[PDB]
A = this chain, B = another copy of it.
Amino acid sequence: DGWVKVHPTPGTMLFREILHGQLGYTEGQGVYNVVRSSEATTRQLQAAIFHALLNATTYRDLEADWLGHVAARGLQPQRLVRRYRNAREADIAGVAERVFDTWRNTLRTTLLDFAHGLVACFAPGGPSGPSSFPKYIDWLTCLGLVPILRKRQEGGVTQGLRAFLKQHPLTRQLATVAEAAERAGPGFFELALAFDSTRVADYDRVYIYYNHRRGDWLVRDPISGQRGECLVLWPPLWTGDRLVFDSPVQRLFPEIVACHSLREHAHVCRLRNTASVKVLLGRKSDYDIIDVSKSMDDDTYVANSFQHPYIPSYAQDLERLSRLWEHELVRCFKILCHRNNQGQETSISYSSGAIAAFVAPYFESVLRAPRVGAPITGSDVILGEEELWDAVFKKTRLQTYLTDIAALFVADVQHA
């Protein structure tokens, strides 16, 4: 009843195998390896965790803990000035600044350690297991669909968070960490459940049906019998007894098949020339390969014979196809390449537009994540994780409180 089977057809499997280089290979197709890297999602996740944790802190606990530290040292400004008993303002100011700098540095190191402790829990899930990003990207590169299956249940990531959080000494040792972690905990649990709940269907098991009249998508898991929820990023076109997707492989397909056929023909012609001497026979009127044409002669005579050992040339086509693959992928997925003065490709990375267009829908639709704050810029992908923590620390809330309390402490030290 107007239903069509879309995915399990042989053409789709041929697309997928074309991606594995089952008919030819090129230098251009090698760029794809970077398009599947999971680095950007992990960087975004690190940025999200850092933003969530640092945003929780507040001025009250920071001031309370600084006061507790100065009381523990017994280094209150009154006592310090009473000990020194001289009015050299520069020396006392420098001493106070260095004390506060020591405390500040140690606090930043502790916070960084805890933050890295948090991230390590989520990282393995992104590339592998439920919600694997490379599978998503190659799903898009093949069809533009992304059949997704969902169930709600606690699993690995939630258990990891539960084990990591509920015993960490750092929360007990500092009020800042205690309040920040207790406030940020619920969101992390929501995100962990989001990571655990959703899995992307496997390319060799799922079934997809499409119906033109309603434009309805039915997706089916044949093993468990579980119905899924289809997603379409680049809508296809229906043209009768057909269905034409707009994925890159479909656009490139009519070209690579012709190139492959040319290569097969050139292979066939080469074997023909292996024998270097040929003989032609006929009927009288009345290494080495010989052509017995006697069987057709009757009241006929041989008029002429010709030789032309043709061998098709195909290197030009391979160069053209390599450049075509490279340009197609680079322009389609918004890849950005850095270059030397004349040398090419020092590194390859997602552009800002690339992360915005591809990573964002992953988190929002595929994962159904709570929130990720402002997205990271393309330049922050190249940064290391430590540098990412540093950079997010520079602009975010905590540094303002630190500078304010430091300046006030120095002023009160001098004026006390």
Q: Could you list which residues of chain A lie within 8 angstroms of chain B, going by C-beta atoms?
A: 13, 16-17, 20-27, 30-31, 33-34, 37-39, 83-84, 86, 91, 95, 98-99, 101-102, 105-106, 109, 112-113, 116, 124, 128, 135, 202-204, 212-213, 215, 223, 232-233, 235, 237-239, 244, 246, 250-255, 258, 262, 265, 267-274, 276-285, 287-288, 290-294, 296-297, 299-310, 312, 315-316, 318, 320, 323-324, 327-328, 331-332, 334, 336, 339-344, 346-348, 351-353, 356-357, 361, 364-365, 373-375, 377, 384-386, 396-397, 400-401, 403-404, 407-408, 411, 415
Minimum Cβ distance to chain B for residue A21 (Å): 4
| B124 with A397: CB separation less than 8 A | no
Whether A403 pairs with B301 at a CB distance below 8 angstroms is: no
Taking the full assembly, how many copies of this chain does it contain? 2
Which of B24, B98, B328, B347 meets A336, CB within 8 Å? Answer: B347
Known interface pairs A20-B244, A116-B374, A318-B320; A278-B277 also in contact (CB < 8 Å): yes
Residues of chain B contacted by A95 (CB below 8 angstroms): 407-408, 411
Residue in B closest to A340 when the chains form the complex, CB atoms = B339
A284 to B328, CA, bound (A): 62
Q: Which of A20, A105, A316 has the most CB of B within 10 A?
A: A20
Question: How long is the Cα–Cα vector from A225 to B332 in the complex, in angstroms?
Answer: 37
Given contacts A244-B17, A278-B277, A353-B39, contact A239 B27 (CB under 8 A): no
Whole-angstrom distance between the alpha carbons of A278 and B280 in the complex?
Answer: 10
CB-CB under 8 A from A91, the residues of chain B are 411
Neighbouring B residues of A223 by C-beta, 8 Å:
213
Given A280-B303, A281-B300, A300-B294, answer yes or no on A26-B324 (Cβ-Cβ < 8 Å): yes
What's the minimum C-beta distance from A316 to chain B, rounded to whole angstroms?
6
B307–A309 touching, CB < 8 Å: no
Q: Which residue of B lies closest to A212 (CB)?
A: B204
B396–A22 touching, CB < 8 Å:
no
| Most B CB within 10 A of own CB, among A250, A374, A397 | A374
Is B276's CB under 8 angstroms from A331's CB? no
Which residues of chain B have C-beta atoms less than 8 A from A316's C-beta?
Answer: 315
B293 and A291 form a contact (CB under 8 A): no
Closest to A104 in B: B400
Please give the distance in Å from A399's CB to the nearest CB on chain B.
9
Which residue of chain B is the closest to A292 with respect to CB atoms? Answer: B296
Partner of A255, one of B20, B24, B235, B276: B24
Given the contacts A22-B254, A106-B397, A306 and B278 also touching, CB distance less than 8 Å: yes
Inter-chain CA distance A328–B271, complex, in Å, is: 30
